[PDB]
Every structure is written in structure tokens, then in C-alpha cells.
Design an enzyme around this catalytic site. Structure first.
Site, PDB file in Angstrom:
ATOM      1  N   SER A  91     -10.063  -5.936  -7.807  1.00  0.00           N
ATOM      2  CA  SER A  91      -9.520  -4.633  -8.211  1.00  0.00           C
ATOM      3  C   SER A  91      -8.588  -4.748  -9.433  1.00  0.00           C
ATOM      4  CB  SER A  91      -8.790  -3.985  -7.027  1.00  0.00           C
ATOM      5  OG  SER A  91      -8.689  -2.590  -7.209  1.00  0.00           O
ATOM      6  N   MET A  92      -7.293  -4.450  -9.280  1.00  0.00           N
ATOM      7  CA  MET A  92      -6.376  -4.632 -10.394  1.00  0.00           C
ATOM      8  C   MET A  92      -6.157  -6.125 -10.679  1.00  0.00           C
ATOM      9  SD  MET A  92      -2.407  -3.333 -11.079  1.00  0.00           S
ATOM     10  CE  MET A  92      -1.694  -4.680 -10.128  1.00  0.00           C
ATOM     11  N   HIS A 135     -14.903  -1.217  -1.698  1.00  0.00           N
ATOM     12  CA  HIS A 135     -13.950  -1.757  -2.675  1.00  0.00           C
ATOM     13  C   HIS A 135     -13.346  -3.131  -2.332  1.00  0.00           C
ATOM     14  CE1 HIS A 135     -11.528  -1.783  -6.179  1.00  0.00           C
ATOM     15  NE2 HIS A 135     -10.375  -1.672  -5.543  1.00  0.00           N
ATOM     16  N   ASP A 150     -18.411   1.971  -3.887  1.00  0.00           N
ATOM     17  CA  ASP A 150     -17.001   1.681  -4.058  1.00  0.00           C
ATOM     18  C   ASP A 150     -16.296   3.018  -4.148  1.00  0.00           C
ATOM     19  OD1 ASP A 150     -14.409   1.249  -5.391  1.00  0.00           O
ATOM     20  OD2 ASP A 150     -15.060  -0.837  -5.655  1.00  0.00           O
ATOM     21  N   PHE A 188      -3.507  -3.934  -6.633  1.00  0.00           N
ATOM     22  CA  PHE A 188      -2.425  -2.946  -6.662  1.00  0.00           C
ATOM     23  C   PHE A 188      -2.083  -2.465  -5.253  1.00  0.00           C
ATOM     24  CE2 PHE A 188      -1.303   1.662  -7.223  1.00  0.00           C
ATOM     25  CZ  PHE A 188      -0.320   1.625  -8.241  1.00  0.00           C
TER      26      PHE A 188
END
Length: 252
Positions: A97-98, A226, A196, A29
Site C-alpha cells: 500500500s503506502m 488490499h 482492491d 498507512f
């Protein structure tokens, strides 16, 4: 929507011709394929066919991003899936992530996917969901500064602002992927940074607990934050994912 800005240099999608095993490599994202390109080059060098797609409204301008839905992001992923399906009888999906969220989405809707490897996948983010009760009180564009990476000196191609309107889009995607996890049967390796500052640590085990996969493992990334693909544990991610790809390719 349609993108008014051009793809930023370095943010281009990557398409690598290879053998009959394909790998779909997804970014997150406000990110771009730049954060996934080292994984993608590594998997390509191993003989695999590889597609890292650019998500719509990503890698151009956050003003573009503001106009995109999560269905747009899915469309962008599905187009890359289809490109792979034309070249490969075996397909794995991995994402950060996303991109990990979208990796889980794909496993939820396409049973022929041979395995998945999300990295710090986000399925529950109370802060973002909290910002939604608000959202009329939010600035049109949030300052997004900087990238969460432990290894110093590392630069990620990603936007410096997050559109507030994109928040409900990622929340709606996470909610939908969350309730649908039980649909996942394929082998899964879940990479999780120890520290994270973006995705809650309880996301990884939660995912582990609610997917129906018989072959599943959590893999710790102890030296990374992250964005782990640009971080200290980058090689660990690659080596583990290659071993994972080989293992299940050999067993079918």
C-alpha cells in the site's frame, strides 16, 4: 513530533541478520510491521538480511500518527535503508500500500537499489484527495473499520481510526512519488490485487507505464483484497519476490 504512546505488542520493527543481500520491507498507512512480518520471516529464512521498519507514529496510537508528516515516514524508511546499507552491498525494497508508495520513493532517490516489489502501491486516490477540498468538515479521527482482506478470520494490527490530518500527508507523498516515477530504472515487479477496495486498480498499470525500468512486470493477486500480505495470495507474493531477488542477485 515525538510519540507519547509505546509500541503495541506485535507492531515492533524486525531486523534480521543475513548475508550480503538485504531486503527492506515497508508497511502502509495506519498499519504496522505486523502486516509485513510473514514476508520478512520468509526472506530471512532464505538467507537474506531483512529490515522491516516501523513508520513513525505507527504501531503506537493514532494520536501519535496525527502529529507525523510524510517526511517523518520517509525518515523512518531511510533509517532502515541505512541499517541495511551497513550490512549489505545488494538491497531490494518491497512494501504494501503506502509502503509500496515508499518503495517507489526509495527507487526514485537511490539508484543503487537493485530492485523493487510494491504490493498494491497507491499513487492516485481521488476519494482521499476529494476529502481534502473539505478537511475542515472532517472528523478529527475517522473511523477506520476494518482491514480489507478476502480470507476470513484474519486480523491486522492497524489503527481503528485514521487522523484526518494524516490524509494530506499521504496525498502529498503520493503526488510527489507520482510525478517522480520516470526516475525509476531498477527492475520492478508490481503486485496488484484483482479486487482492491482501497487502491484503484488503475494505479498498478499507471505505475507500470511511467517508470523507466527495462525489466518490469505486473503480477496479479486474483484471490486477494488490499492487504494482500495477510491474504490468500500471501505465498504467491513471497515465492515471486524470492525468485525476483535471486534472479537479479545472480545477474549482478
Amino acid at each position: 513530533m515525538t510519540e507519547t504512546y509505546p509500541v503495541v505488542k506485535g507492531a515492533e520493527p524486525f531486523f534480521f541478520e543475513g548475508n550480503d543481500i538485504g531486503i527492506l520491507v515497508l508497511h502502509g498507512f495506519t498499519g504496522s510491521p505486523q502486516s509485513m512480518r510473514p514476508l520478512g520471516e520468509a526472506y530471512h529464512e532464505a538467507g537474506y538480511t531483512v529490515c522491516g521498519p516501523r513508520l513513525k507514529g505507527h504501531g503506537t496510537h493514532y494520536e501519535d500518527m496525527e502529529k507525523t508528516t510524510c517526511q517523518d515516514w520517509i525518515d523512518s524508511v531511510e533509517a532502515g535503508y541505512e541499517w541495511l546499507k551497513n550490512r549489505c552491498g545488494t538491497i531490494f525494497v518491497t512494501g504494501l500500500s503506502m509502503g509500496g508508495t515508499l518503495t517507489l520513493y526509495m527507487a526514485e532517490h537511490h539508484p543503487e537499489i537493485c530492485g523493487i516489489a510494491p504490493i498494491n502501491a497507491a499513487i492516485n486516490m481521488p476519494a482521499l484527495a476529494g476529502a481534502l477540498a473539505g478537511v475542515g468538515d472532517l472528523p478529527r479521527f475517522l473511523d477506520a473499520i476494518g482491514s480489507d482482506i478476502k480470507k476470513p478470520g484474519v486480523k491486522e494490527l492497524a489503527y481503528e481510526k485514521t487522523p484526518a490530518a494524516s490524509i494530506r500527508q499521504i496525498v502529498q507523498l503520493m503526488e510527489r512519488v507520482k510525478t517522480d516515477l520516470h526516475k525509476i530504472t531498477c527492475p520492478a515487479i508490481l503486485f496488484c490485487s484483482d479486487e482492491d477496495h482501497v487502491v484503484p486498480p488503475d494505479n498498478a498499470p499507471f505505475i507500470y507505464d511511467h517508470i523507466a525500468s527495462a525489466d518490469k512486470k505486473l503480477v496479479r493477486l486474483p484471490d486477494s483484497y488490499h492487504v494482500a500480505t495477510l491474504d490468500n495470495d500471501r505465498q504467491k507474493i513471497i515465492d515471486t519476490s524470492l525468485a525476483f531477488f535471486k534472479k537479479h542477485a545472480d545477474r549482478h
